[PDB]
Amino acid sequence: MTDRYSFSLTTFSPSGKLGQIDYALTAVKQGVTSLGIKATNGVVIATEKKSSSPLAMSETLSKVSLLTPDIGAVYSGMGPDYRVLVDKSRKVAHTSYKRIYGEYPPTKLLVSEVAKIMQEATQSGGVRPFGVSLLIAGHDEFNGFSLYQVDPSGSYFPWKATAIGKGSVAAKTFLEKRWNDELELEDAIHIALLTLKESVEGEFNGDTIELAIIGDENPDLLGYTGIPTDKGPRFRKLTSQEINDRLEAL
Amino acid sequence: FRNNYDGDTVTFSPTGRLFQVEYALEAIKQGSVTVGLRSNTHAVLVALKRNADELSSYQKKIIKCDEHMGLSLAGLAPDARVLSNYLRQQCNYSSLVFNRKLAVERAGHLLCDKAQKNTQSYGGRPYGVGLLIIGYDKSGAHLLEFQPSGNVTELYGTAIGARSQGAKTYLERTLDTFIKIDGNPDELIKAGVEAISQSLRDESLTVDNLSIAIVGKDTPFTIYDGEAVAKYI
Amino acid sequence: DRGVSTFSPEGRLFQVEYSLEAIKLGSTAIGIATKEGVVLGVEKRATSPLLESDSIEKIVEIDRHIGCAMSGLTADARSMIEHARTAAVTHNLYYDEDINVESLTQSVCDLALRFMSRPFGVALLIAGHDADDGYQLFHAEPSGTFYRYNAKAIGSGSEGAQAELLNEWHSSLTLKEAELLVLKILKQVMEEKLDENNAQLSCITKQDGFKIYDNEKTAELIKELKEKEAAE
Amino acid sequence: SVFSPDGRNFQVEYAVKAVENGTTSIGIKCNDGVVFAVEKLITSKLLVPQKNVKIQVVDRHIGCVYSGLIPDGRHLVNRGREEAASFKKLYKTPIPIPAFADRLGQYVQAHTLYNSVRPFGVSTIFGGVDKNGAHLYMLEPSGSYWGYKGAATGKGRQSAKAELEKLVDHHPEGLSAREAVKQAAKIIYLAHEDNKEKDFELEISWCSLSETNGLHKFVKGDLLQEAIDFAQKEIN
Amino acid sequence: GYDRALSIFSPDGHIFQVEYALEAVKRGTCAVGVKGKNCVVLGCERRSTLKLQDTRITPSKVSKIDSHVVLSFSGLNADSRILIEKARVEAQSHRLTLEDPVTVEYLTRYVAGVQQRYTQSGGVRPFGVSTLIAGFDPRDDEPKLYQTEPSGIYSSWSAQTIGRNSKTVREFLEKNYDRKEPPATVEECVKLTVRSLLEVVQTGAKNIEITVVKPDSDIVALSSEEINQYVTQIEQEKQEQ
Amino acid sequence: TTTLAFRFQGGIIVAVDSRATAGNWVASQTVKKVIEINPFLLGTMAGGAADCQFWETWLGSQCRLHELREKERISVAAASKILSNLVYQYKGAGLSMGTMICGYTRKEGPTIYYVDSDGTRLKGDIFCVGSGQTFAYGVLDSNYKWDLSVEDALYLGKRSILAAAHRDAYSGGSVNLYHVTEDGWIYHGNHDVGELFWKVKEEEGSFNNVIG
Amino acid sequence: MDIILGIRVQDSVILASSKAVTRGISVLKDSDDKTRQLSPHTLMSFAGEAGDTVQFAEYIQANIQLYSIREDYELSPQAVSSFVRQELAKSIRSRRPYQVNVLIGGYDKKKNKPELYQIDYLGTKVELPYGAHGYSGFYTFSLLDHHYRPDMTTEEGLDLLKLCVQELEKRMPMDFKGVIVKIVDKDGIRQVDDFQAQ
Amino acid sequence: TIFSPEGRLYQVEYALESISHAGTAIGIMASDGIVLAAERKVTSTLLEQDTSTEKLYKLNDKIAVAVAGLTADAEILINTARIHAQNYLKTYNEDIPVEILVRRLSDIKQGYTQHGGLRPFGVSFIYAGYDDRYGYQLYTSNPSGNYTGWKAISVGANTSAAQTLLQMDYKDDMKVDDAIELALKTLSKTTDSSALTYDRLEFATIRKGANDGEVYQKIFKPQEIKDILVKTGIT
Ligand SMILES: Cc1ccc(CNC(=O)[C@H](CCc2ccccc2)NC(=O)[C@H](Cc2nc(C(C)(C)C)no2)NC(=O)c2cc(C)on2)cc1
């Protein structure tokens, strides 16, 4: 009992590298590919649902997660690391922002907070960095739609479009070709599905693809009527049925 | 095999040994000799003290613990202070809380448990001292041997320290004689003095060289040094 | 290279043994215990002639009846002195009497055990008087062990100093003889010529307590030694 | 806190060696209790006979005996005692044996989880009578324990285990407490075969529903001699 | 709870972290101090990695502790800020409880004490700093100069130097400084200081800086030009065949 | 209790009574209300007997410690401020003490500080402290001249305590007299009020309020 | 109640403080300085509960001197008074509040204005042309409301205080034993050590 | 946080080594303002430049920093510097003097150097700010906890190259617009890209705000950098 490793496990090498952060990035590279595209009226984030045996229930694993009603996240690298970050991020959106200002945080600031949690594991005693890269997509009244990437070091940066993981190089190139600053949302969904066809080996259907948007407010996903001054969550997981319908005319 | 397995006390060797504990045990062999023996009425400690120079003192090796109990040391002297102090407290706690003189056997169990913790906690070190514990309680006279491994054993007699095997051999043979020295302190002391002798290539044991402590039926624990021991050389 | 409180296969504590080495590199300190008093002398050893010699405090008062000389990493001695003083004043506060010299020493050695990240790099000669046991001299190592001595020397010149103390000490030395002997034995082992600036004398008497001799009274005894040793 | 590449914990494994190196000790379940027994090496003629008690009681109803590092064993029993006290305080009833087993289980197991603690160098045989029967348990340095009809650990464990196996096969009906006491004396004598450079003292304890009212008691005097005698008989 | 012991002994009885701390001192720019009959002077040097520096706002090497005591250092600059802060806090604390400002000896003992503590505590490294502390006791005229080092040893000096090439300047001072006759003028005491620094620095331009302390909290820094008046007087006049 | 200390031409006079009470019970007549801290420092005690004795005995311990640390007698200012700072830590917990720290040093000359358990610390020439203070002030203030001879100042102090011993129910016993110079304090004896009153009455012709 | 007065004239700030220290039925001292210099151009006067009064002043003094020595720079009166306010406002909610009221009189050298700040034990701060703490304010505020002019000289300000003191000697129940007067201008802090029989 | 036999701090030296690979930032101080210029690390077309901030951070209203090193490590230090400034303002009712804020960040850095067994932050700062004691000020801090004041300075990649050029073209009586020019010219010759374009720069000025007597912080937008690139002759 007691924590007896009170020093940093990520130190500087004589060349100025931080080994553990590099190795965490290597872990991300092995990860299943994931992407985000920012449109003019939305953002889309997508990944492959790499099943382990067909006996596993793919729907029961969350690869795309709601963080706040307007914010989503997806990842590449170590799933178990992502899952605990989603929990801590959801909680901090509350403790650090909603309990103070009575409104959910703007995307850049929630991202700032995840970034903080990941940096900490880069410098605290007795811990290793998280083996994930996150893609966070959201909207807020004052900054509109945004998309960010957070890395093992806690670095973040905003993208118009990007991908991470196994086939990241190939996909970044594919998007660069296809991205223009006038895309509707349905256009960006379509481009996301095309980019993701490369990554994937086996089946390519709605039960092997996890895809969510940040779009218009969904009043029927609120759960109550009568306060006309919110129309509801902008985050929306696409159903298996919705993915396939866009794949037929693909 | 002996390589990275003596780093700390919190590590087992592939043989199943704890080398740090074994090394602490080794501080005793290097320590000056002491003897303990008892009959049914009294228990006795005889400790040959060691000097640093001809100009130095013969560092005291017998520590009183209560009116009915005490010990002799061989090894790191500071470690004898830590433990005998803890024993003074346990004796004291027994007196205050329960109006009970603490049983020698319980004193043994308590020392064992204290030493044990240091053979298992990281950043700590085993005690580097062996102790001979005499006492008189409600079940009579007692001698105990403390090993820093946490092993304690009750005996009629024994010896620890430099060339202790000599005295321990003599005692193994003088057994049936001394055990019967009841109600006669001076002969039991003499039997202790003659036991310590079988462990001296050194020399003649002299006036400032010798230390004797005794506890018994109507005799409380008392240490004799110098003038008082002259009659035993 | 593994730990601080680690045992060697010979059953010694590595760090305690290496601290003893540091003490061997220290300036020489000598103590002589008589029936008229206890003398403590030291070698100042200025690392340069620009150093103001009388700013070298290697003999310090603890209580009026207890003084102490040090040798080794003298900076480590600060908190031992401080602790020694607190122990002696606290004792007087709780008991309305002088602390016994043996009790004071035992207390310092208790402090020594508390390794704090490392053992002390300094050994101490503690000298004084109490009603029970009279004039006493103590050597206190950073192991927590202490020893009573009629005479003792610690520091770089101690091997030769001890040998000389072995010949010269007897149970009838007067204080003034004892002063001369400390001075003599220091003159032999010091890597420099002994004068009133590179050596300091001190004593404790029952009547006058612990006094550091000022440079003038020392210079006189140096002059008296040069002469006592001319005729013989 | 270190797995070796084969999935084992190499520090636990070395702890086992230390146990294998210890004095031999046993437990036998009978039809209404448990008996315990141990080999006490007589290092010297100077040891006081009957006076270096290895067997320890927990609460009033649980016996504990062990092989390996004796201090490690005592630490474990101390903890067992607090775990017994804590249970009684909260739930009134004395601690059931399966429950007491998991308490030692988890504690011993905890000492295999962290790099700053070493595992225990004992295997402990313990048991007693609770509200629904007698129970015998053995717990290894990993924290692994199971129930047993018979159990042995220490230097002479193999020869002792073979003897136990024979009894189980030749007494499907169950053994008696009175009998198991004699049999335990036999088994320790047989087991001393693999440690005979020293003389030894025998120590036995038992917890029987009808012979002790379900409390742990030592076997002394008359009954201890009858057991020694019976064991001396089947060796000549 | 990080308490891993960094300052430990080696088999020959040396504490290598304390030793390498001294190495960092000898790496640092040179600092010197010399005391007069009625004064003490402190002198420093500057390096030349870059000279597009702003000198108004860059930390000067002589720091005021109280109004009557100053500290200059050789070694790691970042470490010295920490020793100075604590010395400043203590100086105020001594005034508050003793109703008197510190003696130079007392402030020295305190700073040396803090250095020592850092040589024997878990999970801390010694100070890569050695210091010169100078001034006058309150209501006293006799000048005071003390030196501390990473071990916690401290002592007083007629004159002393520390840092890079101090071996050289201690050489100069040992021949030139007379115990019989301290530089009785403020002026001639600034003389011995600039001379001693000239051996190491080069041209006494934007590199040599000087500070004078007189009794009763009288402490004046110099300007480039008033330094140049000393650079000039020695070069030309002590050039004679 | 009545205690006083005044500064004058020839140093400081310190005089105190020697009575302890509990309610109306006279507990003792032989109590020592002056503490000798070192040969140059005195403290006087008024208020709770234990509070005063304990913390002033402690004050002596802290003053000795300063001698060893700084190789120098502590200043009166700093000795008083140790007591004053300690007592302030305890403010509100109900300590009860009013004291004077008196002594000479080369830096300060003869100095008196009044220290009480409210945390008050004052430097001044003349203080009386205790239940009898007003009786003392009255005699003292109306006979005090800076130019008093040592003999006369000694008497004035003594007489002022007599005054308060007489009128204050919670004062009496005896007077203990001290004189403080550059050479340190000198004790000028114990004086039973039992004897002193009658002697003073006859010799001074005062106390005409008193029968016989 | 001790008397703590402050008047801000055109070129200086003047503080007058009562010299008496009274415990119970005795005036123990008639020459007390209820003032601490905080820096060469900032002066604080204080009244309130017995021990708290000096302990607080000297703690404030220590902090300001520290800052000065650390920055080789003098804090402005506005800054010092904010430090003090926040210190009191902390104290008011602690286990045992400091029961001290203060006047801070300083000369701001950057602005060349003199400044008077009144702060009570609760940490209530205000800047005023003249101020007072305790009962004394009940007489002086109105008196000064009548006689004060914003552009008075330091010599005129001292005549205004003389009125204030004389009024307090006519109407206050207790003998406060006269006042010590101190001036804070561009040249720093000085004492008019001759106010009583003048 | 341990010493080498030489008397240098391993983890620090290696941290500075880390910083030398970071996008270059320059600070230049005029008579009437400070310029902050910094270069982004090998970027992409898809990287959002509009809402992007990574090298230039506002600390309060009078003080900005330029970052060379680990972006996330700097986020930590920026946040606690922002807090310290607000603590100072709350305590004193005065904006924090530049030096004081700089000293505090440096003292934080120094800690990791000396105790706790945590790794230093891999970050260097250029501080540009104004206070009424010393006017415009430029400071620098690195992972050793060391801070110094500058007329002009650079940190990160190619400081040797950049430092040579600034000494060659800087002269005390400079105006802000000349300092802007000097900043961009120096980055033009020390870049690793083919040429310097707008989407690879962050730019900031601390001026005297035309006509007022009050201090203004301007962080140049994309389109604004693009423009100031035209005037100087880099298009
Ligand atoms: C050394 C010395 C002795 C005597 C004095 C003068 N004070 C005194 O004589 C004060 C006066 C009362 C008082 C005033 C203010 C606060 C508390 C108490 N008396 C004192 O402290 C008494 C002394 C005393 N008490 C008793 C008995 C045993 C209660 C009968 N016998 O003597 N203790 C108390 O009042 C006292 C009560 C409790 C509870 O704890 N101490 C000063 C200095």
Residue ranges of domains in chain H, CATH in brackets? 1-235 (3.60.20.10)
Minimal-distance CA residue of chain E relative to H1: E125
3-state class percentages of chain B: helix first, strand second, coil last, to nearest 5: 35, 25, 35
Per DSSP, the residues of chain A read ------SBSS-B-TTS-BHHHHHHHHHHHHSPPEEEEE-SS-EEEEEE---SSTTS-GGGS-SSEEEETTEEEEEEE-HHHHHHHHHHHHHHHIIIIIHHHSSPPPHHHHHHHHHHHHHHTTTSBT-----EEEEEEEEETTTEEEEEEE-TTS-EEEBSEEEESTTHHHHHHHHHHH--TT--HHHHHHHHHHHHHHH--S--STTTEEEEEE-S--GGGSS--S-TT-----EEEPPHHHHHHHHHT-
Q: Is the dihedral of CA E9, E10, E12, E18 positive or negative?
A: negative
Torsion of CA B22, B23, B26, B31, to 10 degrees: -130
Asked if B53 and C6 come within 8 Å (Cβ–Cβ), the reply is no
- Which residue on chain C is closest to F66 by alpha carbon? C85
**Amino acid code (one letter) for H114:** Q
CA dist D188 and D219 (Å) reads: 15
Cβ contact G27:G171 at 8 Å: no
Which residues, including other chains, have CB under 8 Å from residue A199's CB and lie 6 or more apart?
Answer: A32, A33, A48, A165, A166, A167, A171
Contact E173 C50 (CB under 8 A): yes
Q: Could you tell me if A52 lies within 8 Å of chain E, comparing CB atoms?
A: no
Distance CA F154, CA F160 (A): 10
Half-sphere exposure of B163 (CA within 13 A, CB side): 10
DSSP code of C13?
Answer: B
Method: X-ray
Distance F169 CA to ligand 1 centre (A): 15
Is residue C5 within 8 A of residue B124, CB to CB? The reply is yes
Contact between E107 and E88 under an 8 Å Cβ cutoff? The reply is no
**Domain-wise residue ranges, chain D:** 1-236
Which of helix, strand or coil describes residue B97? helix
Sign of CA dihedral D15, D16, D20, D24: positive
Distance (Å, whole) CA B58 – CA B73: 13
Check F122 against G28: CB less than 8 A apart.
Answer: yes
Phi, then psi, of B27 in degrees rounded to 5: -65, -25
* E59 contact residues in H (CB cutoff 8 A): 147-148
Q: Into which CATH architecture does domain D1-236 fall?
A: 4-Layer Sandwich (3.60)
- A 10 A CB-CB count for G171 gives 11
Q: Using CA atoms, how far apart are residues H8 and E20, in angstroms rounded to an integer?
A: 8
H-helix or E-strand spanning residue B133: strand B129-137
By alpha-carbon position, which residue is closest to atom 29 of ligand 1? F22
Q: Where do we find the tokens 């002639």?
A: C49
CB contact under 8 A, E93 and G62: yes
| A 4-63 residues inside an 8 A Cβ radius of D | 4-5
Amino acid letter, B115: A
CA atoms of D89 and D85, how far apart (whole Å): 6
Residue H230, Cβ density class (10 Å: 0-12 exposed, 13-18 middle, ≥19 buried): exposed
**Distance between the two ends of chain D, CA-based, in angstroms?**
50
> Residue written as tokens 């520091």?
C155
Q: Are C114 and C27 in contact (CB under 8 A)?
A: no
Q: Is the dihedral of CA C148, C152, C156, C160 positive or negative?
A: negative
Residue pair G186/G38 in contact (Cβ under 8 Å)? The answer is no
Through-space distance between the first and last CA atoms of chain C, rounded to whole angstroms = 54
Burial (Cβ within 10 Å: 0-12, 13-18, ≥19) of residue H31? middle
Q: Which CATH architecture has domain E1-241?
A: 4-Layer Sandwich (3.60)
Q: Which of G16, G6, G9 is nearest to G191 (CA)?
A: G16
For CA atoms D48, D49, D54, D57, the dihedral sign is negative
Write the residue in G59, G63, G69 that is nearest to E66 by C-beta: G69
Backbone angles phi, psi at E15, to 5 degrees: -100, 100
Verify whether residue F30 is a known catalytic residue.
no
CA distance C99 to C86: 11
From the list C160, C165, C162, C156, the residue with the least C-alpha distance to C34 is: C165
Contact H92 G73 (CB under 8 A): no
User: Is G50 within 8 Å of F114 when comparing Cβ atoms?
Assistant: no
From the CA of F83, how far away is ligand 1's center (Å)?
Answer: 20
F49 CA to centre of ligand 1 in angstroms: 5
* Residue H189: C-alpha distances to residues B186, D227, G55, H109 (Å): 101, 99, 63, 32
Residues 32-51 of H with CB under 8 A from A: 44-48, 51
How much is the CA Rg of chain E, to the nearest whole Å? 18
| Closest of G46, G188, G191 to residue G117, by C-alpha | G46
What residue ranges do the domains of chain B occupy?
A: 1-233
With breaks defined as C to next N over 2.5 Å, after which residues does chain F break? Answer: none
Could you tell me the residue ranges of all domains in chain F?
Answer: 1-212
Structure tokens at F165: 């011993």
Q: Is the CB of residue A2 less than 8 Å away from at least one CB of chain D?
A: yes
Residues on chain A touching D116 (C-beta within 8 angstroms) = 2, 4
C-alpha H93/C-alpha F164 separation (Å) is 56
| Sign of the alpha-carbon dihedral angle for F77, F82, F83, F87 | positive
CA distances from E145 to D158, E39, E110, E133, E153 (A): 80, 10, 15, 6, 14
DSSP state of H233: T
Domain F1-212 CATH assignment equals 3.60.20.10? yes
How many residues does this entry show for chain B?
A: 233
CATH code, B1-233:
3.60.20.10
Could you say which DSSP state residue G101 is in?
A: E
Which of B181, F72, A82, E119 has its CA nearest to residue H3? E119
Contact H124, A14 (CB under 8 A): no
C-alpha–C-alpha distance, residues H52 and H43, integer Å: 12
Burial H173-188 (b: 16+ CB within 10 A, else e): ebebbbbbbbbbbbbb
| Min Cα separation H55/chain G (Å) | 30
User: Which among C7, C109, C149 is the nearest to B56, CB-wise?
Assistant: C149
Residues of E with CB under 8 A from a CB of F: 97-100, 106, 139
As a whole number of angstroms, the distance between CA C87 and CA C62 comes to: 9
Query: DSSP state, H1?
Result: -
**Helix (H/G/I), strand (E/B), else coil: H75:** helix
Both structure tokens of G66: 């520290």
- State the nearest Cα–Cα gap between G74 and chain E, in angstroms: 14
Say yes or no for a CB contact (<8 Å) between G69 and E96: no
CA distance D159 to G103: 95
Sheet strands (E) in chain H: 25-29, 33-39, 56-58, 63-69, 123-131, 135-141, 147-149, 152-155, 201-207, 216-219
For a mutational test of ligand 1's pocket, the pick from F17, F21, F90, i.e. the residue with the most ligand atoms closer than 8 A to its C-beta, is: F21
Contact flag D14-B155 (C-beta cutoff 8 Å): no
Where do the domains of chain E lie?
Answer: 1-241
Cβ of residue E89 closer than 8 Å to a chain G Cβ: yes
Q: How is domain G1-198 classified at the architecture level of CATH?
A: 4-Layer Sandwich (3.60)
**Cβ pairs A/D, distance under 8 A:** 9
Report the nearest-CA residue for atom 31 of ligand 1.
F27
Q: Which of C4, C22, C24 is nearest to C14 (CA)?
A: C4
C-alpha pair distances (Å), G133 with each of A166, G83, G90, G138? 76, 19, 20, 9
CB A164 within 8 A of CB A28: yes
Q: Which of H11, H21, H45 sits opposite A11 (nearest CB)?
A: H11
Could you tell me which of B172, B167, B173, B170 has the C-alpha nearest to residue B205? B167
Q: How far apart are CA B167 and CA B180, in angstroms?
A: 19
What gap in Å lies between CA G60 and CA A111, rounded to an integer?
Answer: 43
Hey, what amino acid is at H203?
F
CA-based nearest residue to F161, from F183, F190, F184: F190
Name chain G contacts of H97, Cβ cutoff 8 Å: 71
Known binding residues of F: 49
3-state secondary structure C164-197: HHHHHCCCCCCHHHHHHHHHHHHHHHCCCCCCCC
For ligand 1, atom 36, the nearest C-alpha belongs to: F22
| Residue B217 and residue B41 in contact, taking contact as beta carbons nearer than 8 Å | yes
| Lookup result for tokens 């001294």 | E22
Q: Are D22 and D67 in contact (CB under 8 A)?
A: yes
Give D200's strand partners: D41
Radius of gyration in angstroms for the set of CA atoms belonging to chain B, rounded to a whole number:
18
Listed resolution, Å: 2.7
For residue C21, count other CB atoms closer than 10 A to its CB: 16
G58 vs E: CB within 8 A:
yes
Taking the CA of residue C89 and the nearest CA in chain F, the distance in Å comes to 6
Q: Give the C-alpha separation, D176 to D167, whole Å.
A: 12
Q: Are B57 and B51 spatial neighbours (Cβ–Cβ below 8 Å)?
A: yes
Tell me the residue length of chain A.
250
Strand pairing class (D145-147; D150-153): unpaired
Give the integer Cα–Cα distance in Å for D48 and D42: 10
User: Hey, is E172 helix, strand or coil?
Assistant: helix
Q: Closest ligand 1 atom to the C-alpha of F23?
A: 12
- Phi then psi for residue F160, to 5 deg, are -70, -35
Q: Is A249 within 8 Å of chain D by CB?
A: no
- Helix E77-98 with F76-89: angle, nearest 10 deg: 100
Characterise D146 by phi-psi region: left (phi > 0), alpha (psi -120 to 50), beta (else). Answer: beta
Ligand 1 centroid to Cα of residue G129, in Å, is 52
Q: How far is G82 from chain H (nearest CA, A)?
A: 5
Distance, in angstroms, between H114 CA and closest chain A CA?
A: 13
Ligand 1 centroid to H207 CA: how many Å? 74
Q: How far is CA A43 from CA A93, A197, E82, F55, H46, in A?
A: 20, 19, 51, 75, 14
3-state SS string for E83-137: HHHHHHHHHHHHHHHHCCCCCHHHHHHHHHHHHHHHCCCCCECCCCEEEEEEECC
Q: How many CB atoms lie within 10 A of CB E184?
A: 12
Q: What angle do CA E157, E160, E166 make, to 5 degrees?
A: 155
Which residues does G13 contact at the CB level (< 8 Å), separation at least 6? G6, G7, G43, G105, G106, G107, G114, G115, G116, G183, G184, G185
Cα gap G87→G59, rounded to integer Å: 10
φ, ψ dihedrals at C111, nearest 5°? -60, -40
In the DSSP assignment, the letter for residue H47 is B
The residues facing C94 across adjacent strands are none
Q: Is B10 left (phi over 0), alpha (psi -120 to 50) or beta?
A: alpha
Neighbours of chain H (3+ CB pairs under 8 A): A, E, G
Conformational region of residue B51, where left means phi above 0, alpha means psi within -120 to 50, and beta covers everything else = beta
Q: D148 to each of D104, D151, E196, H19, H159, how far by Cα in Å?
A: 16, 6, 89, 65, 76
CB-based burial of residue A82 (10 Å sphere; 0-12 exposed, 13-18 middle, 19+ buried)? buried
Contact A118, A153 (CB under 8 A): yes
Report how far residue C222's alpha carbon sits from residue C227's, in angstroms, rounded to the nearest whole number: 9
Closest CA to A2 of E121, E2, C118: E2
Distance CA E155, CA E132 (A): 10
Which residues of chain E lie closer than 8 angstroms to A125, CB-CB?
A: 2
* Binding region of F for bortezomib: 49
Q: Residue H65: exposed, middle, or buried by beta-carbon count in 10 A (0-12, 13-18, 19+)? A: buried
| The dihedral sign for the CA sequence D163, D165, D170, D175 | positive
D122: nearest Cα among D103, D139, D144: D139
Which residues lie below 8 Å from residue F68, measured CB to CB, with a gap of 6+?
A: C61, C62, C63, C85, C89
Quick one: residue B183, left, alpha or beta (phi over 0 = left, psi -120 to 50 = alpha)? left
Contact criterion met (CB below 8 Å) for H138 and H152: yes
Beta bridge partners of D35: D28, D206
Which of H3, H104, H163, H167 best probes binding to E when mutated, by most E CB atoms within 10 angstroms?
A: H3
Residue D180: alpha-carbon gap to chain centroid: 14
- Cα distance from A124 to chain D (closest Cα, Å)? 19
How many angstroms separate the CA atoms of D140 and D203, rounded? 22
Instruction: Report d(CA H221, CA H202) in Å as an integer.
Output: 8
DSSP state for residue E52 in the 8-state scheme: -
Cα–Cα distance for residue pair C105/B77, rounded to 1 Å? 14
Does residue E91 sit at the G interface (CB-CB below 8 Å)?
yes
Q: Which residues of E206-222 are buried (b: 16+ CB within 10 A; e: fewer)?
A: ebbbbbbbbbeeebeeb
Q: φ and ψ at B128, to 5 degrees?
A: -105, 45
Residue A186 exposed, middle or buried by CB count within 10 Å (0-12, 13-18, 19+) = middle
Distances B189 to B26, B47, B145, B165, F45 between C-alpha atoms, Å:
29, 12, 19, 19, 59
Rounded to 5°, the CA angle B34-B36-B41 comes to 155
Which tokens hold the place of A144? 């509109």
Catalytic residue among F1, F2, F44, F99: F1
Joined tokens for residue H70 = 């680990």
F177 Cα to the center of ligand 1, angstroms: 22
Domain A1-250 falls under CATH 3.50.50.60: no
Residue with tokens 């804070």: G184
Cα distances (Å, whole numbers) of residue A2 to A107, D110, G154 = 37, 12, 69
Substitution target in E96, E217, E219, E220 with the highest count of G β-carbons within 10 Å is E96
What SS3 class is residue F162?
helix
CATH number, domain with residue C209: 3.60.20.10
β-bridge mates for residue F122, sequence order: F114
